Amino acid sequence: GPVPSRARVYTDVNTHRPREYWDYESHVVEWGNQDDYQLVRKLGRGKYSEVFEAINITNNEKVVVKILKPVKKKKIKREIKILENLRGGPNIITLADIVKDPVSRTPALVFEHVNNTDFKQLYQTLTDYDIRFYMYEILKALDYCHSMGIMHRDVKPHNVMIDHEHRKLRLIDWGLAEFYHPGQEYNVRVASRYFKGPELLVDYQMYDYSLDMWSLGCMLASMIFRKEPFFHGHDNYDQLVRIAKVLGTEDLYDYIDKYNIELDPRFNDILGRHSRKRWERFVHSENQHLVSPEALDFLDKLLRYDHQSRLTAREAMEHPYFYTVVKD
Numbered sequence: 001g002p003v004p005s006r007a008r009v010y011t012d013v014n015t016h017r018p019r020e021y022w023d024y025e026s027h028v029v030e031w032g033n034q035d036d037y038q039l040v041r042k043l044g045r046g047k048y049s050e051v052f053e054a055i056n057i058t059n060n061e062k063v064v065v066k067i068l069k070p071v072k073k074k075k076i077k078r079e080i081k082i083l084e085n086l087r088g089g090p091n092i093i094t095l096a097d098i099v100k101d102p103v104s105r106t107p108a109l110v111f112e113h114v115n116n117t118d119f120k121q122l123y124q125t126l127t128d129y130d131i132r133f134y135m136y137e138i139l140k141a142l143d144y145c146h147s148m149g150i151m152h153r154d155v156k157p158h159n160v161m162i163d164h165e166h167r168k169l170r171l172i173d174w175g176l177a178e179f180y181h182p183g184q185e186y187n188v189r190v191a192s193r194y195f196k197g198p199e200l201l202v203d204y205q206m207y208d209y210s211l212d213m214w215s216l217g218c219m220l221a222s223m224i225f226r227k228e229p230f231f232h233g234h235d236n237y238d239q240l241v242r243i244a245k246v247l248g249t250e251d252l253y254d255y256i257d258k259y260n261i262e263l264d265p266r267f268n269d270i271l272g273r274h275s276r277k278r279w280e281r282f283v284h285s286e287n288q289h290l291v292s293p294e295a296l297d298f299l300d301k302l303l304r305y306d307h308q309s310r311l312t313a314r315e316a317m318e319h320p321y322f323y324t325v326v327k328d
């Protein structure tokens with residue numbers, strides 16, 4: 001059966017912690033007062049929640065209220081415990097309160113207000129500098145959560161809220177996030193298609209923080225090449241094909257061979273044989289101002305099949321691509 005894997009960083013951060021930290025099932029929700037929040041405008045609805053702009057009438061402050069759909073008790077407390085564990089971390093959305101919505105009969109999570117513009121709204125028109133700036137901002141969030149024993153598992157532009165006026169970013173929607181426990185098998189049905197890492201797509205369950213670094217790489221590629229999304233699969237199978245047309249099939253074989261796993265036989269008729277491409281082939285007159293050798297080397301080091309060989313968040317922050325970004 002499959003060869004086991006472990007994160008190369010923050011491997012044992014949870015094993016050491018008190019039960020209370022990661023055992024979200026035992027978490028006791030502290031409830032605030034639902035009457036403090038008045039919904040103003042519905043902003044979105046997803047599989048797991050409806051999202052509102054609201055106002056907190058105890059301070060007159062705008063907030064964002066997320067009213068959870070019924071799903072699995074356990075998922076609610078997981079997201080809650082994660083948010084409280086991460087609260088105050090860099091670029092992590094701040095859970096301000098948790099109230100019981102009297103209509104839905106479910107928890108409503110109250111977040112700090114963020115401008116109603118996701119990253120996908122502007123990330124195809126940022127300058128080279130701004131891409132590097134915002135990527136470093138994302139990396140701060142991801143190294144923070146990974147250092148706290150947590151993988152986001154749904155990194156994508158919709159989950160990065162950007163207030164470009166204020167050059168401020170928050171990583172949101174922690175409802176798929178999970179505690180990393182060495183040796184634990186996880187559900188591969190996480191992340192959105194275009195951002196799923198190869199480990200998800202080959203059903204390798206013993207994955208870790210590095211899943212998020214694949215997702216980040218897909219964001220990077222789509223920004224610097226101005227191609228949204230960068231790996232544009234029609235489904236989860238073609239999604240792997242799309243990656244193999246860039247990263248080549250021999251390295252895909254080397255990856256699954258290293259972990260002693262087998263592709264779905266469904267790939268026999270669709271995968272073909274593909275050489276690894278040089279990143280230069282995605283450069284053209286319209287995106288060349290966004291591409292530099294550093295950008296390409298950084299991207300190359302994120303988009304690796306072998307989740308063990310991807311830059312970690314902290315390594316990525318060390319990369320020369322960020323030398324041009326002014327650090328606070």
Ligand SMILES: Cc1cc(O)c2c(c1)C(=O)c1cc(O)cc(O)c1C2=O
Pocket residue numbers: 043044051064066093111112114115116117161172173174175
């Ligand atoms: C259209 C839209 C606008 C938003 O401001 C948010 C969201 C969606 C959203 O899904 C969201 C999820 C979350 O877990 C925290 C948030 O602050 C949010 C949001 O803030």
